[PDB]
């Protein structure tokens, strides 16, 4: 599924509005990318499907902290 493994971001629904304000249903999708993250403490790469926001979260918090959160949540990687 199009879900961020770090933030849990996922598609949300809303509307397209025209100039005449006709509403038609649409989705907003997350900006997801599969990325190989270097884990120094395990001397290996782990691939995560992450939003760009999630990539920033990993930059801020460190891949080890994020992976501990994933293990706590039960999300396998």
């Amino acid at each position: 599924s199009r879900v961020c493994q770090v933030t849990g971001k996922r598609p949300v629904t809303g509307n397209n509005r025209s100039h005449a304000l006709n509403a038609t249903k649409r989705r907003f999708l997350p900006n997801l990318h599969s990325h190989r993250f270097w884990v120094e403490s395990e001397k290996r790469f782990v691939t995560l499907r992450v939003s760009a926001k999630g990539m920033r979260v990993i930059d801020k918090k460190g891949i080890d902290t994020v992976l501990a959160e994933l293990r706590a949540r039960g999300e396998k990687y």
Binding site: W38, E40, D59, G62
Partner: protein, 148 residues
Amino acid sequence: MQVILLDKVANLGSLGDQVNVKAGYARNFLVPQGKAVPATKKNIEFFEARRAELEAKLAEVLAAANARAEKINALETVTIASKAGDEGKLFGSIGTRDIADAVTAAGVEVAKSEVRLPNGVLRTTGEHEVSFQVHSEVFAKVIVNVVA
């Protein structure tokens, strides 16, 4: 992104420098290669308290690289044999893997990643000049004799 350099990085700075680099530069090259670390408070204080041994290790690495380069230079010429036509042009080719294997057989262990072929991969019999980069600043040269 703010990082602390753990080595000399060209166009960036010296060991212990705190530099602002692009996030992708840090994320995909410097940190995985070990040339830098994120400039967190823990990292800054830990490195500053425990700094000098790192320059000691860098000097040791540079000395080991110099010794390996001296051994490579003393090796001088290495001969590799293959098959070729009557005109001296090889049907196949002579690349980094077999060049490194020949050097290792000659006595000095060099990895394929340290071989630097300027004019591509050798395709003719004769004598060629190849370069080796065992350290980011040192360079060695080897004569390669390709025979049929």
